[PDB]
Amino acid sequence: SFSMVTRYAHSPEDIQHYDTSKLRHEFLMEKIFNPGDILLTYTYNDRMIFGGVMPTDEPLEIKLSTELGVDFFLQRRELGIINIGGAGAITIDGRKDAMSNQDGYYIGMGTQKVVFTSEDRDHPAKFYVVSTPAHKTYPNKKLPFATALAKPMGDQQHLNKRTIYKYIDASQMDTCQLQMGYTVLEPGSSWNTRMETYMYFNFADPETRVFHFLGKPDETRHITLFNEQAVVNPSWSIHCGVGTTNYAFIWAMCG
Amino acid sequence: SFSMVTRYAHSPEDIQHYDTSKLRHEFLMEKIFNPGDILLTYTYNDRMIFGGVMPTDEPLEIKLSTELGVDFFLQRRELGIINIGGAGAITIDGRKDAMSNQDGYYIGMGTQKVVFTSEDRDHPAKFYVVSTPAHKTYPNKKLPFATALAKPMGDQQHLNKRTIYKYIDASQMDTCQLQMGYTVLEPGSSWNTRRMETYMYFNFADPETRVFHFLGKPDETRHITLFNEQAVVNPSWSIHCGVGTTNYAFIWAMCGENQ
Secondary structure, three states: OEEEEEEOOOOOOOHHHOOHHHHHHHHEEOOOOOOOOEEEEEEOOOOEEEEEEOOOOOOEEOOOOOOOOOOOHHHOEEEEEEEOOOOEEEEEOOEEEEEOOOOEEEEOOOOOOEEEEEOOOOOOOOEEEEEEEOOOOOOOEEEOOOOOEEEEEOOOOOOOOEEEEEEEOOOOOOOOOOEEEEEEEOOOOOEEOOEEEEEEEOOOOOOOOEEEEEEOOOOEEEEEEOOOEEEEEOOOOOOEEEEOOOOEEEEEEEO | OEEEEEEOOOOHHHHOOOOHHHHHHHHEEOOOOOOOOEEEEEEOOOOEEEEEEOOOOOOEEOOOOHHHOOOOOOOOEEEEEEEOOOOEEEEEOOEEEEEOOOOEEEEOOOOOOEEEEEOOOOOOOOEEEEEEEOOOOOOOEEEOOOOOEEEEEOOOOOOOOEEEEEEEOOOOOOOOOOEEEEEEEOOOOOEOOOOEEEEEEEOOOOOOOOEEEEEEOOOOEEEEEEOOOEEEEEOOOOOOEEEEOOOOEEEEEEEOOOO
16 A cells, blocks of 8 residues: 655744644654555655655555656655664665665665565564655665764763764765664653654653654644654754653654 | 732633743743742632742741731631741741751641741742641641651653652641642653642753643643743643653642542
8 A cells, every 4th residue: 555645834833723633633644654555744844755664565666756747756856764674675776785674775866766675574674764855866875784873972861861873964975955864762861852854663661652842942832752653843843852761763854 | 029920720621722922821930939029829720829938138928918808818728838948937926947948837727927037148048838728727837858758759761760758748747728749850860740739840950951841631731841940830630740851859739629
């Protein structure tokens, strides 16, 4: 199955009049990884496409062309990939490259065919994909987790003992607009601290909840997030959230 | 100086249409302790009065009578006091009792005169007072910080490692309606986690500390950003939980009809 919903952009004044149901609908993607399905979100906040691909029996491919007014998906877009599930693979125009857990992959503009596959049907791969518009072609690059930018951050007094892993960084590679990273908070910490998209996952306990704040620096609102859910953070909003236990998340930037 | 403002009670459906500015105005007391002033809040949530008394050179007394339809402040009310500032004292109908830091005191119905003083003007006492209506007179009782019912709670995995001190508890004493306590969170913990309560957050770790206090029904929930030495009212229909950027302390007070 396949599903991509369209979500519009709003002003800070517009979200003042949203009840908790309206606010969740406009900013929260509630389902990302369903076995065998592709679930994407198109937000007019900088026209980013994000979601999850979890292959089971048949391999999946983002067959988008008429929907975006182009001949193929990445004709005018770049793509960032992070695998949060079991071992899998990605096939770029015939080239097959193995992607284990926590492995990343950047795919440049112009690449026409990208097919996602998993190694085990019962333990499928969970590809978190993000796509932004692109005007220039940059070379494709595999980002193995072994050689990933590991930079420890935060202390215990501030509830932010974390480790940030920069996959697609402007210092390590050149990109049109997309930047992607992966931050894990250690137990005892839950705080994380101009368009951004946060996808929370790897909750410590099954009853964990992450409270994500959005809005102007003082006229703030919040959204309650459960495991494997994402929130769009427009440029006019603050980037901060806090959890009941520790967690992990994948961020993506553009603008 | 003296000041008491009045705040009404609302329904869950009523605050659903509040922006963040109105929500602060109806539920958040932004200033509590000012040197030489008495700052109080009268909330129609069970008609509780709370605030701060901070004596400097001249002693302070909550002179209320006509405003409450009574002859004196405590004619039909009980009063609980916890000092969070410097060393001071309270004079109860002539009798003076010294109150050090974190010392508490319950004053029963019928007590006619309660005068607040501090020992040093440059390091004054900060008396956080809570008053609820009372129909029966119970004996006055000083609550030294040493002899307070303390029970630690929470672990580190849930970021709520705290120790709660019960001052006015139904197991240790008899009161009409008021129950009051003091909770300090360990460094590296920030989470607070059926009745009406009033929380007053203070002793912020950093000058840049913020406490986000959640209120509303378990599904339609909102939050209020608290700075140091500010208070929020929890109506009976609302949830009681808050989270801070660092660790902090707060004083809670309950009323209604429970134990």
